[PDB]
Structure formats: structure tokens, C-alpha cells
Amino acid sequence: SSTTGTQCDI
Amino acid sequence: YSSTTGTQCDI
Amino acid sequence: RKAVIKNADMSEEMQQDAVDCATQALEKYNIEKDIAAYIKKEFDKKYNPTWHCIVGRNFGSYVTHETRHFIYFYLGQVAILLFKS
Amino acid sequence: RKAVIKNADMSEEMQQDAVDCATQALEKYNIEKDIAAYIKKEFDKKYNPTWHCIVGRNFGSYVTHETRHFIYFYLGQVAILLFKS
């Protein structure tokens, strides 16, 4: 179990 | 007790 | 910032808390991921883990949420999805 | 069309599956919610519940995922988040 961020545009 | 639902946005 | 609740399986004041929290996040951060981080972490804290947050202007989702722990709302020009699995 | 894996905590095979499955979804559906539904149901079917999927061109996220059950990728001009809690 872990935590992580994602970010998108385009 | 779990439920399943969809969301949609374009704004 | 106009708040509009789209879909909610969640108590009145917990919903209000989602809006308030999201408001603080939008005041501090501009990046959707960081905004998402802020909200998620505060809901872990006040209402116990484990929450997940999605913030954006364009996305669709299909998730399974624990009962009484789901909100989907607009706050100004972004949509926010917050839920316990 | 063009697949690009951004972050993956997931086997190379199950990654390639996620791509193949998402490709099927885009072939059949146009609406992000439906695409996400297709992907989530299929992964629930082949690798057991509970999966959650987000499909979009503009969003950020912060979620808590199961070890070896997290992927985030682009496929053509759409981003896809798929994970178990």
C-alpha cells in the first residue's frame, strides 16, 4: 500500500 | 456496504 | 467560487466540509495534484483513512465507494471527486 | 494510439494489458465515464475487485493504492488512472 500523485494537461 | 458510480465533467 | 454538489452519498455537514476544505486548497495551491493532495490528507485526518481525491476540469470516473463517503462537486471552474474506497 | 506509461507500480504484463484494455474502450466508447467504466469492470473481472478508473484530458489526483496495483498512463490524447485501493 502506497500513495502517489498524478497531473495532466494537454 | 459499497456502491459504484460514474462521474463526467467537461467544464 | 460557486459550489455545486453534483452527486453525494454523504452527510450534510460532511459535504459542507468537503467544500470548505476544497476552498482552502484552491486558495493555497494552483496545481490540481497538489489541490487533490490537500483535500485527501485533511479527510484522512478528520474522518479517518482512507480517502482518494481527483481534481480537474475534464475527466470521467467510475469508482466504488464505501457508503456515506462519496462526494462529487464543482467548486468554481474545477470538478472535485472525493471518496472512501 | 500512442501509449506512454507515466508512473506504474504494476507488472509489465498487467501494464500492457491495461493499455490493450483501454484501447478496446476507446474503440467502443467516446465518453470518458464510459471508457473508465469499461476499464474498471474488465479489471474487476480479470484480476478481482476492487478497481477504480479515471479517464481524462485535464485532471490531477492523489490516491492511496495497493502495492503492485497502480498505473497512470496516456493513450493517444487521454490520460488514464487505474488502481486498487
Domains and CATH numbers, chain C: 1-85 (3.30.740.10)
* CA dist., res. D67 & res. D36, Å (int): 21
- Interchain pair B5, C57: CB under 8 A: no
Q: Residue C49 and residue D64: Cα distance in Å, rounded?
A: 9
* Grid coordinates belonging to C59: 475527466
Nearest C-alpha neighbor of C54 from the set D78, D19, D37, A8: A8
The Cα–Cα gap between C51 and D46 comes to 25
Measured CA to CA, the distance from residue D20 to residue D77 in angstroms comes to: 16
CA distances from C27 to C35, C38, C43, D3, D6 (A): 9, 11, 17, 35, 28
Q: What is the per-residue burial (b if ≥16 Cβ within 10 Å, else e) of C43-74? A: beeeeeebbbbbbbbbbbbbbbbbeebbbbbb
Query: Measuring CA to CA, which residue among D8, D70, D54 is closest to residue C36?
Result: D54
Bridge partners of C45?
none
Resolution of this entry in Å?
Answer: 1.9
Please choose, from the candidates C84, C56, C13, the residue with its C-alpha nearest in 3D space to the C-alpha of residue B7: C56
Q: How far apart are CA D24 and CA D38, in angstroms?
A: 9
Cβ-based contacts of A2 with chain D (< 8 Å): 9, 64-65, 67, 70
Residue C77 in contact with residue C57, Cβ under 8 Å? yes
Chain A contact for D57 (CB, 8 A cutoff)? yes
Nine-digit cell string for C21? 476544505
Q: Is C81 exposed, middle or buried (0-12, 13-18, 19+ CB in 10 A)?
A: buried
Using what technique was this structure determined? X-ray
- Helices D32-47 and D12-28, interaxial angle, to 10°? 140
Angle between helices C32-47 and C12-28 (to 10 degrees): 140
